[PDB]
Amino acid sequence: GAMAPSYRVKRMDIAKNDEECVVNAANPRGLPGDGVCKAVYKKWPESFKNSATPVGTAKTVMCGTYPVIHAVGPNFSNYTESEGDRELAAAYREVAKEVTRLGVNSVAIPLLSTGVYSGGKDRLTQSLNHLFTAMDSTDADVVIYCRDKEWEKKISEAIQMRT
Ligand SMILES: Cc1n/c(=N\[C@@H]2CCC[C@H]2CO)s[nH]1
Ligand SMILES: [Cl-]
Ligand SMILES: [Cl-]
Ligand SMILES: [Cl-]
Structure with a gap:
C-alpha cells in the first residue's frame, strides 16, 4: 500500500503516466477505439490480446x-x-478489485463514460463520485488524468473539498 494513500489530478496524456499500472477507458470488443483507448493502444498494444469484456x-x-x-x-x-x-458504478468497483489483486502502490485512471460514451452530457461529477466510491477503500495512490483545463480545476476542487 501507499504510506499515506492520496488522490491527485494531472492534465496530460495518461500514456505518459508515472504510476505502477493504468486503467484504459476500453470498449467491450478490445478494439483500438478513440481518445484514451487510442493512446493506450499506441503505448501498450500487447495488452489488447483477449481484452474484450462486457x-x-x-x-x-x-x-x-x-x-x-x-x-x-x-x-x-x-x-x-x-x-x-448502475453500469458506470459497477465498472469502477471492478477496477478497485483489480488494483487490490495486483498489489500495486499507485494507479493512473481516466474518468469513464465522460468522452464519446457521455451521450453528449457533462458527467464529471457523476463519474468522479463513482470513482471515489470504489477507490476510497483501496490504499493505492490514485492519479486521475484529464485533458480539459476547466475539468482539471473542478476535479482538483472536488479532491481538496474532502481535505
Ligand atoms: C489521452 C487522455 N485522454 C484522457 N481523457 C479523455 C478526454 C475525453 C474523454 C476522456 C476519457 O476517455 S486522459 N489522457
Ligand atoms: Cl501530454
Ligand atoms: Cl468515454
Ligand atoms: Cl477531460
Missing part, C-alpha cells in the same frame, strides 16, 4: 510486467440514465 467489468492484461486494466463504462447513447449509472 460493459460494467474490468479485465487486466499485462504489457511486459506493466498491468493495463481495461474498464468498460457504458455508452450513455444506448443505456437509460438509470441503467447507465
Whole structure:
C-alpha cells in the first residue's frame, strides 16, 4: 500500500503516466477505439490480446510486467440514465478489485463514460463520485488524468473539498 494513500489530478496524456499500472477507458470488443483507448493502444498494444469484456467489468492484461486494466463504462447513447449509472458504478468497483489483486502502490485512471460514451452530457461529477466510491477503500495512490483545463480545476476542487 501507499504510506499515506492520496488522490491527485494531472492534465496530460495518461500514456505518459508515472504510476505502477493504468486503467484504459476500453470498449467491450478490445478494439483500438478513440481518445484514451487510442493512446493506450499506441503505448501498450500487447495488452489488447483477449481484452474484450462486457460493459460494467474490468479485465487486466499485462504489457511486459506493466498491468493495463481495461474498464468498460457504458455508452450513455444506448443505456437509460438509470441503467447507465448502475453500469458506470459497477465498472469502477471492478477496477478497485483489480488494483487490490495486483498489489500495486499507485494507479493512473481516466474518468469513464465522460468522452464519446457521455451521450453528449457533462458527467464529471457523476463519474468522479463513482470513482471515489470504489477507490476510497483501496490504499493505492490514485492519479486521475484529464485533458480539459476547466475539468482539471473542478476535479482538483472536488479532491481538496474532502481535505
Ligand atoms: C489521452 C487522455 N485522454 C484522457 N481523457 C479523455 C478526454 C475525453 C474523454 C476522456 C476519457 O476517455 S486522459 N489522457
Ligand atoms: Cl501530454
Ligand atoms: Cl468515454
Ligand atoms: Cl477531460
